[PDB]
Short mmCIF file of C-alpha atoms and ligand atoms in Angstrom, two decimals:
data_model
loop_
_atom_site.label_atom_id
_atom_site.label_comp_id
_atom_site.label_asym_id
_atom_site.label_seq_id
_atom_site.Cartn_x
_atom_site.Cartn_y
_atom_site.Cartn_z
CA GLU A 1 0.00 0.00 0.00
CA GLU A 2 1.19 3.49 -0.93
CA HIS A 3 -0.37 4.74 2.30
CA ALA A 4 1.84 2.45 4.40
CA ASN A 5 4.96 3.35 2.41
CA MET A 6 4.09 6.99 3.10
CA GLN A 7 3.67 6.52 6.85
CA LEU A 8 6.85 4.47 7.11
CA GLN A 9 8.95 7.16 5.44
CA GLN A 10 7.23 10.05 7.23
CA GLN A 11 8.53 8.52 10.47
CA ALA A 12 12.07 9.44 9.38
CA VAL A 13 11.42 13.14 8.74
CA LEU A 14 12.34 14.78 12.04
CA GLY A 15 15.55 12.75 12.45
CA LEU A 16 16.46 13.61 8.87
CA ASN A 17 15.92 17.33 9.54
CA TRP A 18 18.22 16.95 12.55
CA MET A 19 20.97 15.20 10.58
CA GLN A 20 20.74 17.46 7.53
CA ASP A 21 20.10 20.90 9.04
CA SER A 22 21.23 21.03 12.67
CA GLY A 23 24.45 22.53 13.96
CA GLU A 24 24.13 19.95 16.74
CA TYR A 25 24.69 17.08 14.30
CA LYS A 26 27.83 18.82 12.97
CA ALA A 27 29.07 19.33 16.53
CA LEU A 28 28.67 15.62 17.27
CA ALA A 29 30.67 14.80 14.12
CA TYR A 30 33.47 17.19 15.11
CA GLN A 31 33.37 15.76 18.66
CA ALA A 32 33.86 12.24 17.31
CA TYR A 33 36.72 13.17 14.99
CA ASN A 34 38.43 15.34 17.61
CA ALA A 35 38.34 12.37 19.99
CA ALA A 36 39.54 10.06 17.22
CA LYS A 37 42.64 12.18 16.62
CA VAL A 38 43.50 12.13 20.34
CA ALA A 39 43.12 8.33 20.38
CA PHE A 40 45.23 7.92 17.23
CA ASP A 41 48.04 10.10 18.57
CA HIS A 42 48.08 8.19 21.87
CA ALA A 43 48.07 4.75 20.24
CA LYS A 44 51.10 2.50 20.37
CA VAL A 45 51.25 -0.80 18.53
CA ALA A 46 53.16 -4.05 18.98
CA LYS A 47 56.73 -4.23 17.71
CA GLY A 48 56.77 -4.87 13.97
CA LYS A 49 53.16 -3.79 13.42
CA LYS A 50 51.93 -0.92 11.27
CA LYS A 51 49.25 1.44 12.64
CA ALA A 52 45.81 1.04 11.08
CA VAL A 53 42.56 2.89 11.61
CA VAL A 54 39.39 1.14 10.48
CA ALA A 55 36.67 3.46 9.24
CA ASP A 56 33.14 2.76 8.15
CA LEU A 57 31.93 4.80 5.17
CA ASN A 58 28.17 5.36 5.09
CA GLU A 59 27.07 7.88 7.73
CA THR A 60 30.57 7.79 9.20
CA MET A 61 32.76 9.37 6.54
CA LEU A 62 30.22 9.70 3.71
CA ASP A 63 26.93 11.56 4.04
CA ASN A 64 24.10 9.95 2.05
CA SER A 65 21.26 12.02 3.51
CA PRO A 66 19.96 13.10 0.07
CA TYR A 67 19.02 9.45 -0.56
CA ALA A 68 16.94 9.53 2.64
CA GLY A 69 15.41 12.79 1.43
CA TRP A 70 14.46 11.10 -1.84
CA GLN A 71 12.88 8.28 0.18
CA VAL A 72 10.76 10.79 2.08
CA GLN A 73 9.68 12.65 -1.04
CA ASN A 74 8.81 9.50 -2.98
CA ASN A 75 7.47 7.32 -0.16
CA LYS A 76 10.16 4.74 -0.91
CA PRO A 77 11.23 2.11 1.61
CA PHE A 78 14.91 1.17 1.40
CA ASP A 79 15.77 -0.90 -1.66
CA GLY A 80 19.29 -1.95 -2.57
CA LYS A 81 18.59 -1.36 -6.26
CA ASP A 82 17.72 2.27 -5.58
CA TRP A 83 20.79 2.50 -3.34
CA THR A 84 23.08 1.36 -6.15
CA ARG A 85 21.66 4.11 -8.37
CA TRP A 86 22.25 6.64 -5.59
CA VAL A 87 25.89 5.52 -5.32
CA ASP A 88 26.26 5.74 -9.11
CA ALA A 89 24.84 9.28 -9.01
CA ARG A 90 28.12 10.41 -7.41
CA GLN A 91 26.54 13.01 -5.13
CA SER A 92 27.82 11.75 -1.77
CA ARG A 93 28.93 14.40 0.70
CA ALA A 94 31.52 14.16 3.48
CA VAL A 95 30.70 13.88 7.17
CA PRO A 96 32.14 16.94 8.96
CA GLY A 97 35.68 16.37 10.24
CA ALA A 98 36.10 13.06 8.39
CA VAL A 99 38.38 14.17 5.55
CA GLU A 100 40.71 16.07 7.90
CA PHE A 101 40.97 13.11 10.27
CA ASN A 102 41.46 10.66 7.41
CA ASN A 103 44.21 12.73 5.84
CA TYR A 104 45.88 13.35 9.20
CA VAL A 105 46.09 9.62 9.97
CA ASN A 106 47.49 8.89 6.53
CA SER A 107 50.20 11.56 6.87
CA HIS A 108 51.18 10.61 10.43
CA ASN A 109 52.40 7.03 10.20
CA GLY A 110 48.95 5.47 9.98
CA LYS A 111 46.68 4.04 7.30
CA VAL A 112 42.90 4.30 7.19
CA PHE A 113 41.14 1.26 5.74
CA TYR A 114 37.54 1.63 4.61
CA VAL A 115 35.46 -1.31 5.77
CA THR A 116 32.05 -0.61 4.35
CA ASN A 117 28.94 -2.31 3.08
CA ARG A 118 28.89 -0.41 -0.15
CA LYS A 119 29.08 -3.24 -2.67
CA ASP A 120 32.48 -4.08 -4.14
CA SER A 121 31.17 -5.24 -7.51
CA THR A 122 28.65 -2.49 -8.34
CA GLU A 123 29.29 0.46 -6.01
CA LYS A 124 33.09 0.78 -5.87
CA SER A 125 33.60 3.13 -8.83
CA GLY A 126 31.19 5.78 -7.54
CA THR A 127 32.58 5.48 -4.02
CA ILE A 128 36.16 6.06 -5.11
CA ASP A 129 35.20 8.91 -7.42
CA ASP A 130 33.20 10.69 -4.72
CA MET A 131 35.95 10.27 -2.14
CA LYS A 132 38.60 11.69 -4.46
CA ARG A 133 36.31 14.64 -5.22
CA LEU A 134 35.57 15.18 -1.53
CA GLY A 135 39.28 15.48 -0.75
CA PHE A 136 40.15 12.17 0.90
CA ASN A 137 43.79 11.10 0.53
CA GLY A 138 44.72 7.42 0.38
CA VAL A 139 41.78 6.21 -1.68
CA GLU A 140 43.62 3.77 -3.91
CA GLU A 141 41.62 0.57 -4.40
CA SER A 142 43.69 -1.42 -1.90
CA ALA A 143 42.53 0.82 0.97
CA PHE A 144 39.00 -0.47 0.45
CA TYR A 145 37.26 -3.47 1.94
CA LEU A 146 33.82 -3.22 0.34
CA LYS A 147 31.12 -5.86 0.77
CA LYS A 148 31.54 -9.06 -1.16
CA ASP A 149 29.73 -12.09 0.29
CA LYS A 150 29.22 -11.10 3.94
CA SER A 151 27.66 -8.03 5.57
CA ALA A 152 29.31 -8.78 8.92
CA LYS A 153 32.65 -6.97 9.04
CA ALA A 154 34.89 -8.94 11.42
CA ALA A 155 36.42 -11.08 8.66
CA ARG A 156 37.52 -7.95 6.82
CA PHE A 157 39.08 -6.60 10.02
CA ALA A 158 41.00 -9.88 10.22
CA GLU A 159 42.22 -9.46 6.62
CA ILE A 160 43.72 -6.10 7.58
CA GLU A 161 45.49 -7.63 10.58
CA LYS A 162 46.89 -10.43 8.38
CA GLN A 163 48.57 -7.73 6.29
CA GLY A 164 50.73 -6.72 9.25
CA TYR A 165 48.54 -4.00 10.73
CA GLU A 166 47.39 -3.44 14.28
CA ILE A 167 44.02 -1.67 14.33
CA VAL A 168 44.32 1.12 16.89
CA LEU A 169 40.73 2.35 16.65
CA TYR A 170 37.46 1.88 14.80
CA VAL A 171 35.12 4.61 13.57
CA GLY A 172 31.46 3.90 12.79
CA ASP A 173 27.77 4.79 13.13
CA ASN A 174 26.66 1.16 13.65
CA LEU A 175 27.75 -1.16 16.47
CA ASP A 176 28.41 -3.76 13.77
CA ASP A 177 31.31 -1.51 12.72
CA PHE A 178 33.15 -2.66 15.86
CA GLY A 179 32.88 -6.43 15.42
CA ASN A 180 30.38 -9.27 14.96
CA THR A 181 29.26 -10.00 18.49
CA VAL A 182 25.83 -8.35 18.12
CA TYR A 183 25.45 -8.69 14.37
CA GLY A 184 21.85 -9.65 13.58
CA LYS A 185 20.87 -9.32 17.24
CA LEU A 186 18.01 -7.37 18.78
CA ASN A 187 18.49 -4.08 20.58
CA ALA A 188 18.59 -5.50 24.12
CA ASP A 189 21.71 -7.50 23.22
CA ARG A 190 23.14 -4.48 21.40
CA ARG A 191 22.65 -2.21 24.41
CA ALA A 192 24.31 -4.89 26.56
CA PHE A 193 27.36 -4.91 24.28
CA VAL A 194 27.65 -1.15 24.70
CA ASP A 195 27.39 -1.39 28.51
CA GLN A 196 30.06 -4.11 28.47
CA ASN A 197 32.35 -1.76 26.53
CA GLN A 198 31.44 1.55 28.19
CA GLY A 199 35.02 2.78 28.57
CA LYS A 200 35.97 2.19 24.95
CA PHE A 201 33.63 4.77 23.44
CA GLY A 202 35.41 7.95 22.40
CA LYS A 203 38.68 6.05 22.81
CA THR A 204 39.03 2.93 20.64
CA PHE A 205 35.42 2.82 19.37
CA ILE A 206 34.47 6.18 17.85
CA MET A 207 30.74 6.77 17.31
CA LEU A 208 28.97 8.93 14.72
CA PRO A 209 25.20 9.59 15.07
CA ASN A 210 22.68 8.02 12.68
CA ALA A 211 18.99 8.34 13.56
CA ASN A 212 17.86 7.25 10.09
CA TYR A 213 18.85 3.58 9.63
CA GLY A 214 21.12 0.77 10.76
CA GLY A 215 21.42 -2.41 12.80
CA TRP A 216 19.33 -0.73 15.50
CA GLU A 217 16.40 -0.60 13.07
CA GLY A 218 16.49 -4.34 12.47
CA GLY A 219 17.06 -4.61 16.21
CA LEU A 220 13.53 -3.32 16.87
CA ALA A 221 11.93 -6.74 16.30
CA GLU A 222 12.72 -10.35 15.43
CA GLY A 223 12.73 -10.68 11.64
CA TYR A 224 12.17 -6.95 11.16
CA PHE A 225 13.82 -6.68 7.74
CA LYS A 226 11.67 -9.53 6.40
CA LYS A 227 8.40 -7.93 7.54
CA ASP A 228 6.24 -5.98 5.10
CA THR A 229 5.79 -2.22 5.38
CA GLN A 230 2.82 -2.47 7.73
CA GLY A 231 4.77 -4.90 9.90
CA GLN A 232 7.71 -2.53 10.15
CA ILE A 233 5.42 0.36 11.07
CA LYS A 234 3.89 -1.78 13.81
CA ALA A 235 7.34 -2.84 15.04
CA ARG A 236 8.44 0.79 15.35
CA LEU A 237 5.28 1.88 17.15
CA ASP A 238 5.34 -1.17 19.43
CA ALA A 239 8.92 -0.34 20.47
CA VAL A 240 7.89 3.11 21.70
CA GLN A 241 8.09 3.59 25.46
CA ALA A 242 5.43 6.07 26.51
CA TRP A 243 4.44 7.89 29.67
CA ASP A 244 0.87 6.91 30.57
CA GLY A 245 -0.02 10.55 31.23
CA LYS A 246 -0.50 9.97 34.96
CA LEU A 247 1.37 10.93 38.14
CA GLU B 1 -6.82 19.17 12.81
CA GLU B 2 -6.23 15.82 14.49
CA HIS B 3 -4.85 14.56 11.18
CA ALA B 4 -2.11 17.21 11.17
CA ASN B 5 -1.27 16.60 14.83
CA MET B 6 -0.91 12.93 13.93
CA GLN B 7 1.41 13.54 10.97
CA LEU B 8 3.53 15.98 12.95
CA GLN B 9 4.13 13.50 15.76
CA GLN B 10 4.58 10.51 13.43
CA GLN B 11 7.59 12.36 12.01
CA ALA B 12 9.37 11.83 15.35
CA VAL B 13 8.94 8.05 15.53
CA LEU B 14 12.13 6.72 13.96
CA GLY B 15 14.38 9.16 15.85
CA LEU B 16 12.58 8.23 19.05
CA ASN B 17 13.14 4.51 18.39
CA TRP B 18 16.82 5.33 17.91
CA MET B 19 17.10 7.31 21.15
CA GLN B 20 15.05 4.88 23.24
CA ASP B 21 16.12 1.47 21.92
CA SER B 22 19.50 1.68 20.18
CA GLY B 23 22.83 0.67 21.66
CA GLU B 24 24.26 3.33 19.35
CA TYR B 25 22.56 6.12 21.30
CA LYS B 26 23.99 4.72 24.56
CA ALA B 27 27.45 4.55 22.98
CA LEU B 28 27.24 8.22 21.98
CA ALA B 29 26.27 9.12 25.56
CA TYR B 30 29.21 7.16 26.99
CA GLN B 31 31.49 8.74 24.37
CA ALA B 32 30.43 12.22 25.47
CA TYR B 33 30.87 11.54 29.18
CA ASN B 34 34.18 9.74 28.68
CA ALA B 35 35.44 12.80 26.79
CA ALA B 36 34.00 15.09 29.46
CA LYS B 37 35.99 13.35 32.21
CA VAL B 38 39.22 13.71 30.22
CA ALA B 39 38.51 17.42 29.72
CA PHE B 40 37.67 17.93 33.40
CA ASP B 41 40.84 16.19 34.58
CA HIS B 42 42.98 18.26 32.19
CA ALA B 43 41.38 21.58 33.14
CA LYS B 44 43.28 24.20 35.09
CA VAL B 45 41.66 27.40 36.32
CA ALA B 46 42.89 30.88 37.18
CA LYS B 47 44.43 31.43 40.62
CA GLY B 48 41.70 31.88 43.23
CA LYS B 49 38.96 30.32 41.09
CA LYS B 50 36.94 27.21 41.88
CA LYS B 51 36.36 24.61 39.13
CA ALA B 52 32.82 24.49 37.75
CA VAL B 53 31.19 22.28 35.16
CA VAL B 54 27.98 23.55 33.60
CA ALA B 55 25.51 20.85 32.65
CA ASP B 56 22.21 21.04 30.86
CA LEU B 57 19.50 18.71 32.19
CA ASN B 58 16.93 17.68 29.60
CA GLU B 59 18.36 15.18 27.10
CA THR B 60 21.81 15.79 28.56
CA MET B 61 21.63 14.36 32.07
CA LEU B 62 17.90 13.56 32.26
CA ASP B 63 16.10 11.32 29.78
CA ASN B 64 12.52 12.46 29.07
CA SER B 65 11.87 10.13 26.14
CA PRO B 66 8.65 8.71 27.67
CA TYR B 67 7.09 12.17 27.25
CA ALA B 68 7.95 12.00 23.54
CA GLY B 69 6.44 8.51 23.46
CA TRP B 70 3.25 9.90 24.99
CA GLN B 71 3.23 12.60 22.29
CA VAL B 72 3.44 9.95 19.59
CA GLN B 73 0.71 7.80 21.10
CA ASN B 74 -1.68 10.71 21.68
CA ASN B 75 -0.86 12.85 18.63
CA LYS B 76 0.14 15.70 20.94
CA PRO B 77 2.34 18.58 19.79
CA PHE B 78 4.61 19.96 22.51
CA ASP B 79 2.76 21.96 25.15
CA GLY B 80 4.42 23.40 28.25
CA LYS B 81 1.37 22.53 30.36
CA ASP B 82 1.72 18.85 29.46
CA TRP B 83 5.46 19.13 30.09
CA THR B 84 4.89 20.40 33.63
CA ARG B 85 2.68 17.38 34.32
CA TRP B 86 5.39 15.10 32.93
CA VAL B 87 7.96 16.67 35.27
CA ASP B 88 5.54 16.31 38.20
CA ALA B 89 5.07 12.63 37.30
CA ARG B 90 8.61 12.00 38.58
CA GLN B 91 9.48 9.35 35.99
CA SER B 92 12.60 10.93 34.50
CA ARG B 93 15.46 8.59 33.70
CA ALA B 94 19.19 9.29 33.58
CA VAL B 95 21.22 9.66 30.40
CA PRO B 96 23.87 6.91 30.34
CA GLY B 97 27.16 7.98 31.93
CA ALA B 98 25.72 11.22 33.35
CA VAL B 99 25.41 10.25 37.02
CA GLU B 100 28.93 8.79 37.13
CA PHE B 101 30.42 11.88 35.51
CA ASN B 102 28.42 14.22 37.73
CA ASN B 103 29.46 12.43 40.90
CA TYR B 104 33.09 12.21 39.77
CA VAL B 105 33.30 15.97 39.18
CA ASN B 106 31.72 16.68 42.55
CA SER B 107 34.18 14.40 44.38
CA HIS B 108 37.27 15.65 42.54
CA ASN B 109 37.50 19.33 43.38
CA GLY B 110 34.76 20.43 41.00
CA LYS B 111 31.11 21.42 41.17
CA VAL B 112 28.45 20.69 38.57
CA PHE B 113 25.82 23.40 38.17
CA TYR B 114 22.58 22.52 36.41
CA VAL B 115 21.60 25.24 33.96
CA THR B 116 18.33 24.03 32.57
CA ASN B 117 15.06 25.26 31.15
CA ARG B 118 12.96 23.20 33.48
CA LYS B 119 10.94 25.90 35.23
CA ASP B 120 12.14 27.08 38.63
CA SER B 121 8.68 27.88 39.99
CA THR B 122 6.70 24.80 38.93
CA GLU B 123 9.17 22.09 37.91
CA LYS B 124 11.93 22.25 40.53
CA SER B 125 10.47 19.83 43.09
CA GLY B 126 10.06 16.97 40.61
CA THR B 127 13.49 17.63 39.12
CA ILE B 128 15.26 17.44 42.47
CA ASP B 129 13.30 14.38 43.55
CA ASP B 130 14.07 12.51 40.33
CA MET B 131 17.75 13.41 40.46
CA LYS B 132 18.12 12.21 44.05
CA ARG B 133 16.36 8.96 43.11
CA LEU B 134 18.54 8.53 40.02
CA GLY B 135 21.71 8.73 42.13
CA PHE B 136 23.06 12.21 41.43
CA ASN B 137 25.18 13.71 44.22
CA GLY B 138 25.25 17.47 44.79
CA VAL B 139 21.60 18.19 44.09
CA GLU B 140 20.98 20.71 46.83
CA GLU B 141 18.84 23.61 45.57
CA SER B 142 21.80 25.97 45.19
CA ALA B 143 23.33 23.76 42.48
CA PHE B 144 20.36 24.57 40.25
CA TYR B 145 19.84 27.40 37.81
CA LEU B 146 16.36 26.64 36.49
CA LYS B 147 14.47 28.93 34.13
CA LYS B 148 12.99 32.06 35.61
CA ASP B 149 12.39 34.90 33.15
CA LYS B 150 14.76 34.05 30.29
CA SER B 151 15.23 30.90 28.20
CA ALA B 152 18.66 32.03 26.98
CA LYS B 153 21.28 30.66 29.38
CA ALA B 154 24.27 33.02 29.21
CA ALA B 155 23.09 35.19 32.11
CA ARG B 156 22.94 32.13 34.35
CA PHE B 157 26.46 31.16 33.29
CA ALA B 158 27.52 34.65 34.35
CA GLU B 159 25.85 34.20 37.76
CA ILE B 160 27.99 31.12 38.34
CA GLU B 161 31.16 33.01 37.42
CA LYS B 162 30.20 35.84 39.80
CA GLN B 163 30.21 33.27 42.61
CA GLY B 164 33.94 32.70 42.13
CA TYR B 165 33.83 29.80 39.67
CA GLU B 166 35.64 29.30 36.40
CA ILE B 167 33.56 27.12 34.06
CA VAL B 168 35.94 24.53 32.63
CA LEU B 169 33.46 22.85 30.30
CA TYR B 170 29.82 22.80 29.24
CA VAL B 171 27.66 19.74 28.58
CA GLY B 172 24.49 19.94 26.48
CA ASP B 173 22.31 18.62 23.66
CA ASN B 174 21.45 22.10 22.31
CA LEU B 175 23.92 24.68 21.00
CA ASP B 176 22.13 27.20 23.22
CA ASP B 177 23.66 25.28 26.13
CA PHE B 178 27.02 26.82 25.18
CA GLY B 179 26.05 30.50 25.10
CA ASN B 180 23.65 32.96 23.50
CA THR B 181 25.29 33.74 20.18
CA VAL B 182 22.87 31.66 18.09
CA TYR B 183 19.89 31.74 20.43
CA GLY B 184 16.72 32.20 18.36
CA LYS B 185 18.69 31.94 15.12
CA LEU B 186 18.06 29.73 12.11
CA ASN B 187 20.09 26.63 11.37
CA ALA B 188 22.50 28.24 8.88
CA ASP B 189 23.76 30.56 11.64
CA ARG B 190 23.83 27.66 14.09
CA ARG B 191 25.93 25.50 11.75
CA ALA B 192 28.26 28.49 11.29
CA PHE B 193 28.75 28.77 15.05
CA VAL B 194 29.72 25.10 15.16
CA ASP B 195 32.22 25.51 12.30
CA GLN B 196 33.70 28.53 14.09
CA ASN B 197 34.19 26.39 17.20
CA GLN B 198 35.16 23.09 15.56
CA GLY B 199 38.06 22.34 17.91
CA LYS B 200 36.06 22.85 21.10
CA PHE B 201 33.69 19.92 20.62
CA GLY B 202 34.58 16.94 22.78
CA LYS B 203 36.89 19.25 24.72
CA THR B 204 35.19 22.27 26.33
CA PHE B 205 31.78 21.86 24.64
CA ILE B 206 30.46 18.33 25.21
CA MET B 207 27.57 17.25 22.96
CA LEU B 208 24.79 14.75 23.62
CA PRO B 209 22.51 13.64 20.73
CA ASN B 210 18.87 14.75 20.52
CA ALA B 211 16.99 14.02 17.29
CA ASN B 212 13.61 14.77 18.86
CA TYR B 213 13.50 18.51 19.69
CA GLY B 214 15.52 21.64 20.37
CA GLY B 215 16.77 24.93 18.99
CA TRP B 216 17.47 23.15 15.70
CA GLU B 217 13.73 22.52 15.32
CA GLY B 218 12.90 26.21 15.60
CA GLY B 219 15.92 26.75 13.37
CA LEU B 220 14.12 25.05 10.47
CA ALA B 221 12.18 28.21 9.55
CA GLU B 222 11.65 31.85 10.53
CA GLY B 223 8.91 31.98 13.17
CA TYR B 224 8.66 28.18 13.31
CA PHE B 225 7.39 27.94 16.89
CA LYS B 226 4.60 30.42 16.14
CA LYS B 227 3.35 28.48 13.09
CA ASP B 228 0.36 26.15 13.37
CA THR B 229 0.73 22.39 13.05
CA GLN B 230 0.32 22.39 9.27
CA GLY B 231 2.91 25.15 9.02
CA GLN B 232 5.42 23.18 11.07
CA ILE B 233 4.85 20.08 8.95
CA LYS B 234 5.48 22.16 5.83
CA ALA B 235 8.61 23.70 7.37
CA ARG B 236 10.04 20.26 8.13
CA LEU B 237 9.28 18.89 4.67
CA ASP B 238 10.56 22.03 2.96
CA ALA B 239 13.88 21.72 4.83
CA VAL B 240 14.47 18.24 3.41
CA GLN B 241 17.35 17.98 0.95
CA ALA B 242 16.57 15.25 -1.55
CA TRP B 243 18.37 13.49 -4.36
CA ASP B 244 16.43 14.05 -7.60
CA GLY B 245 16.74 10.37 -8.50
CA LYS B 246 18.99 11.08 -11.48
CA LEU B 247 22.67 10.54 -12.32
N1 AMP C 1 17.98 3.11 5.06
C1 AMP C 1 18.69 1.97 4.95
N2 AMP C 1 18.24 0.81 5.45
C2 AMP C 1 18.93 -0.34 5.34
N3 AMP C 1 20.12 -0.42 4.74
C3 AMP C 1 20.69 0.68 4.21
C4 AMP C 1 20.01 1.97 4.28
N4 AMP C 1 20.80 2.87 3.67
C5 AMP C 1 21.91 2.20 3.25
N5 AMP C 1 21.84 0.89 3.58
C6 AMP C 1 22.80 -0.18 3.28
O1 AMP C 1 23.73 -0.25 4.34
C7 AMP C 1 25.07 -0.03 3.84
C8 AMP C 1 25.86 0.71 4.88
O2 AMP C 1 27.22 0.85 4.49
P1 AMP C 1 28.34 1.24 5.54
O3 AMP C 1 27.68 2.03 6.61
O4 AMP C 1 29.47 1.90 4.79
O5 AMP C 1 28.75 -0.12 6.07
C9 AMP C 1 24.85 0.70 2.51
O6 AMP C 1 25.95 0.56 1.62
C10 AMP C 1 23.57 0.07 1.99
O7 AMP C 1 23.83 -1.18 1.37
N1 AMP C 2 9.58 18.62 22.24
C1 AMP C 2 9.85 19.83 22.77
N2 AMP C 2 9.75 20.96 22.03
C2 AMP C 2 10.00 22.17 22.54
N3 AMP C 2 10.39 22.37 23.81
C3 AMP C 2 10.54 21.33 24.64
C4 AMP C 2 10.29 19.96 24.17
N4 AMP C 2 10.51 19.14 25.22
C5 AMP C 2 10.89 19.92 26.27
N5 AMP C 2 10.91 21.22 25.91
C6 AMP C 2 11.23 22.39 26.75
O1 AMP C 2 12.62 22.63 26.67
C7 AMP C 2 13.21 22.56 27.98
C8 AMP C 2 14.60 21.98 27.86
O2 AMP C 2 15.27 21.99 29.11
P1 AMP C 2 16.84 21.80 29.19
O3 AMP C 2 17.24 20.99 28.01
O4 AMP C 2 17.17 21.25 30.56
O5 AMP C 2 17.33 23.23 29.04
C9 AMP C 2 12.21 21.74 28.79
O6 AMP C 2 12.31 21.96 30.19
C10 AMP C 2 10.87 22.17 28.21
O7 AMP C 2 10.46 23.41 28.76
MG1 MG C 3 27.74 3.18 8.30
MG1 MG C 4 18.64 19.95 26.94
#
């Protein structure tokens, strides 16, 4: 139903306004990247290791909010085929602070590797073109670990380590950017992971804000991503914790 | 129109799910408070000054998300009279990391002052009761600078300084928690303020995420808060930046 598609996408509007328009969102991005630089400068690695930083791309270093805007305007639930066209459109923006941090790491005895679920086979060319245009240094193909057969990222982290790197910090907007332990899990387990790692945030796990999509969306209900539009609407509304209006 | 009230509040749903349910939101809160502790420990003040930390309350140290949930369920635009009842309900929660940071400052030669737009005359009793219950130390009345006649906060910051304190850092979810220079201004000016202070974030200005309300909402359009429901809906949708769907 077009009506359901409309309601589902309307639910994203206020968070999208916040991400696209607010100074507060920018401040959170700068806060993250300022903290990331401190962590990078402090980091020491094992003898014989090279210093690596692992960075997510979407909503961490690259800003895809215009795709979300298109979803709102056209009542379009997420579809990977539309996403591929968005990537090919080569209109990605940079998250504030990301280029400066990236280029600083790469010029100060580190290497940023991009571990991202943009698709290696169909989305790599647009990604690399946009990143060059946006001012990122170090965007030769070998810096990229785009999605091949698995959305979970831990195996790609391991590939980087096998190449003689020690990963000194991770940057992401999704907890699945820090490992696999809550991949595909519901939000209670994901909150628990965060509590179990409280001291790492702003140090070795650097968070960017994303109120629009992610593992937390699937985390709203068992089988969320396989539900139809009406089911996803219901899952979102059922997750709401509300005051009963009483004292 | 009930229909417009419904649409307006539906637009908050996804961001509310993110704030209420996601581990990512918790991680951002921990990141902020971890950074705040580092900044506090590093801070040195002028000879003869006492160390103060200024903290916002709502969506910085106190979590009022159930009020937002009630808005969604009842199609209720924000109303200060409803807000006062929410405060009186004494069901506020704590933002993750806030109590620990607060109590650490207060036991390590600092004092946290709460500069907040909860209302001094009608909302103070519930605020203090909730904070005691939530585990905050240092919540005697004199630690509080609740709203009296002005929503802008700079004058209250000045009161704190007049009492012999040097403010070493500010914690907030709203740029207006850092001063008055973009109070009542639109989002372009607010983004500019952030760019002009890029290096302060995560150091002397500590940001918490709030995708649900704030100065950025009013910042969406001239006279936003005076518009009717339909006008606010239009302002939000008009602010959306969308991909045109082309290459
Ligand atoms: N709104 C959305 N809902 C679900 N998946 C999305 C959405 N937007 C993007 N994606 C996918 O998630 C990936 C995230 O990539 P990254 O954050 O770099 O790992 C994208 O490349 C898309 O395949
Ligand atoms: N959704 C909302 N829209 C506008 N104002 C709000 C909303 N929720 C709360 N407020 C007001 O903003 C104040 C924020 O307080 P604080 O963040 O502590 O300065 C609250 O005490 C309310 O008076
Ligand atoms: Mg991402
Ligand atoms: Mg606040």
